[PDB]
Every structure is written in structure tokens, then in C-alpha cells.
Write a protein that binds this ligand. Structure first.
Ligand SMILES: [Cl-]
Ligand SMILES: [Cl-]
Length: 164
């Protein structure tokens, strides 16, 4: 049984997660931005970065934003969409949620959302969260609406990698 720390160390070795300067602390209790999570997905699934395309209207979403090539890759791949679709806002500094991460991973693994799933997720996500739980990516007792912890994302990424 690998611990969350051992799963993180393996993912860091692989270039999927990064740690922090000066310490071996992986901050497993802390949160992750949507920009960072798009980079995680690009590394985890070996996606091509997309330069010189900008699908969203967020302020400071341009060539000087380090995250755009990753955000564009997960967008073209169908993994992430904006937080709001009429204004085309990605919310790159916003934190990724359990249920958002669930939808990305379920889609990337070509799994099927569960129809008429009953759980605490936002309506759009109930099926994705349920599919993610059933695949072992998140615990049934996780809060789907919460910001996902780095621990949770490590576990989910690790499991997804094994399924691929
Ligand atoms: Cl921590
Ligand atoms: Cl969990």
C-alpha cells in the first residue's frame, strides 16, 4: 500500500506534479488552481501544449500567462471548459473542485457518467462524481463541491495513471 506521499513522489519523478523550493513538503493538505490542474492533466496524459491560441476572455489570459498553452490543450482535448460558458471565463486562478476534477478524469479515461446518480454534487456533476467514486478516484465521503486537496488530486491522478 503506497501512501499518498509515495504516490506524490512517483508523480513528481514523472514530471506530473511539482513540489516546492527548499523543502520536501508536498503540501498535501493545500489546494490547487485550475491553471495548475490543467498542467497536471497535460503531463499526466501526455497532451501537446497549444501556443498562440486563446479560447477565453479572462483578464491576463494572453501570451504572458504561463498557463495558457496547458489550458488550451485540455480545452481542445475536451477535458475542461470554462466556468462560465456564455462569458468564456476559465477562472484560471480559481481552485479546482473535487467534482470538476472528477469530470476531467472520467472524460480522460473514457468512462461513462452515472445516470440519475444521487449524491451531494452540483446537478451537472452528479454523474461524473459518481463515476469517479466508482472508479476509485475519489472517496464516496469526499465533498464534491469542495476545493480538492493536493492529496486528493494525487490519489486521483495516481489511480487514473494506473487505469491508463
Ligand atoms: Cl499541507
Ligand atoms: Cl477523496
Amino acid at each position: 500500500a503506497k501512501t499518498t506521499q509515495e504516490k506524490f513522489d512517483a508523480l513528481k519523478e514523472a514530471g506530473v506534479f511539482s513540489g516546492y523550493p527548499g523543502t520536501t513538503d508536498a503540501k498535501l493538505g493545500q489546494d490547487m488552481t485550475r491553471a495548475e490542474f490543467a498542467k497536471v492533466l497535460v503531463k499526466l496524459f501526455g497532451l501537446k501544449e497549444i501556443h498562440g491560441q486563446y479560447s477565453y476572455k479572462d483578464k491576463n489570459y494572453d501570451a504572458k500567462n504561463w498557463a495558457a498553452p496547458f489550458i488550451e490543450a485540455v480545452t481542445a482535448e475536451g477535458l475542461m471548459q470554462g466556468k462560465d460558458l456564455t462569458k468564456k471565463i476559465f477562472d484560471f486562478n480559481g481552485k479546482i473542485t473535487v467534482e470538476e476534477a472528477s469530470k476531467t478524469l472520467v472524460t480522460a479515461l473514457k468512462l461513462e457518467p452515472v445516470k440519475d446518480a444521487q449524491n451531494k454534487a452540483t446537478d451537472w456533476a452528479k454523474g461524473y462524481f459518481e463515476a469517479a467514486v466508482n472508479a476509485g478516484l475519489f472517496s464516496k465521503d469526499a465533498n464534491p463541491k469542495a476545493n480538492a486537496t493536493r492529496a486528493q488530486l494525487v490519489e486521483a491522478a495516481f489511480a487514473a495513471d494506473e487505469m491508463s
